[PDB]
From a paper:
We studied one type III effector from plant pathogenic bacteria called Pseudomonas syringae. A crystal structure of free AvrB revealed that it adopts a novel bilobal fold with no structural homologies to previously characterized proteins or functional domains.
The structure of AvrB complexed to RIN4142–176 revealed that the peptide forms a “Z” shape with the N-terminal half contacting the upper lobe and the C-terminal half straddling the interface between the two lobes. The interaction of AvrB with RIN4142–176 does not alter the overall structure of AvrB (unpublished data). The N-terminal half of RIN4142–176 interacts mainly through hydrophobic burial of RIN4 W154 plus a hydrogen bond between the indole nitrogen of RIN4 W154 and AvrB D213. The most extensive interactions of RIN4142–176 with AvrB involve the C-terminal half of the RIN4 peptide. First, there is a set of antiparallel beta-strand hydrogen-bonding interactions between main-chain AvrB residues 120 to 124 (within strand β1) and RIN4 residues 167–171. Second, there is a hydrogen bond between the main-chain of RIN4 N170 and the AvrB R209 guanidinium group. These interactions allow this region of RIN4 to form an additional strand of the beta-sheet in the upper lobe of AvrB. Above this hydrogen-bonding arrangement, the aromatic rings of RIN4 Y165 and F169 as well as interleaving H167 are thrust against the surface formed from the last two turns of AvrB helix α7. The guanidinium groups of AvrB R209 and AvrB R266 buttress the termini of the ring-stack, contacting RIN4 F169 and Y165, respectively, via π–π interactions such that the guanidium groups are also almost parallel to the three stacked aromatic rings of RIN4.
Residue numbers in the entry:
A (entry chain C): 150 to 172
B (entry chain A): 26 to 53, 56 to 103, 107 to 321
Write the structure that this text describes.
């Protein structure tokens, strides 16, 4: 279990490349 | 320049054509009607671009990347802009290691070049993580590329993720996990794209010369593939474009590259290795078996 920590997480991240403004 | 042979008359068997550009995760779509068609479409557009390359009709790697983008775009839709735009230096690129990237988690944890660092998070706190740091060397200078992170303190995660959901709210939590998910890939800084695109143009220029041994040609193609994919130049569809460009260059020389073996996702295999390493294994990632 390396990624099963977010079991049934309604806020899980979507599986694809996302872009954000550099902080 | 000097016209190249162009795509070979002897084509791949139809079942292979339908596997071109596929994402065959070792843990899992490539058998579906829409994917077969999508893959056969890529195979065909690659040959078309290849014909052009052989006639000197595509003189820059940027031009070739443009053809790849047009193809991928015709296969699309609000996400259009993302598949058509390059990554600007005012942004970061992050891919959370969630379905369908689960197989990656283990690849990072057991990687020979992985190490343990502490990843501080203003929500989960400091986390122990297995980290793979892809770097490149161009003109004598290191240039860090993609960085993979996989947290090991699982127990703590599932419990802590819980409290946060209710404390901050699902909406806010997702906004955070989307960029700072405990297990994720932080992609090559867009600021390096300018210098990398120029390099891709030199590789392209070389792969367009008519006097190269097959071996040299394959290595040049594997290199180009590695750089294009690891750089992940566009906001979306970089893997598809990188593979298109690589195959097209090959097709221009009369080489019919077979689909990547099942379990081998080309762009991920690239992000997980150094340049020479990937160049030496490229051939083995391709399914070139008769039976």
């Amino acid at each position: 279990k390396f990624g099963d920590w977010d079991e049934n997480n309604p806020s899980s991240a979507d599986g694809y490349t996302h872009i954000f403004n550099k902080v | 320049f000097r016209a190249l042979p162009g795509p070979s008359q002897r084509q791949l068997e139809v079942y292979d054509q339908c596997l071109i550009g596929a994402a065959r995760w070792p843990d899992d779509k490539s058998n579906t009607p829409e994917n077969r068609a999508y893959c056969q479409s890529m195979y065909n557009s690659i040959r078309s671009a290849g014909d052009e390359i052989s006639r000197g009709g595509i003189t820059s790697f940027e031009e070739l990347w443009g053809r790849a983008t047009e193809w991928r775009l015709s296969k699309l839709e609000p996400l259009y802009s993302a598949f058509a735009s390059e990554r600007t230096s005012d942004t970061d690129a992050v891919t959370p290691l969630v379905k369908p990237y689960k197989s990656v988690l283990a690849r990072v944890v057991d990687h020979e070049d992985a190490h343990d660092e502490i990843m501080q998070d203003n929500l989960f706190g400091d986390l122990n993580v297995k980290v793979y740091r892809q770097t490149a060397y161009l003109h004598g200078n290191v240039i860090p590329l993609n960085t993979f992170r996989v947290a090991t303190d699982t127990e703590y995660l599932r419990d802590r993720v819980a409290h946060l959901r209710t404390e901050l709210g699902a909406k806010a939590l997702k906004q955070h996990l989307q960029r700072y998910n405990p297990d994720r890939i932080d992609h090559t800084n867009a600021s390096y794209l300018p210098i990398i695109k120029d390099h891709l143009n030199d590789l392209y220029r070389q792969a367009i010369s008519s006097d190269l041994s097959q071996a040299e040609l394959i290595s040049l193609i594997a290199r180009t593939h590695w750089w294009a994919a690891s750089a992940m130049p566009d906001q979306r569809g970089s893997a598809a474009k990188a593979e298109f460009a690589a195959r097209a260059i090959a097709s221009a020389h009369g080489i019919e590259l077979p689909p990547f073996r099942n379990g081998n996702v080309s762009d991920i295999e690239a992000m997980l290795s150094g340049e020479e390493e990937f160049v030496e294994k490229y051939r083995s990632l391709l399914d070139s078996d008769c039976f």
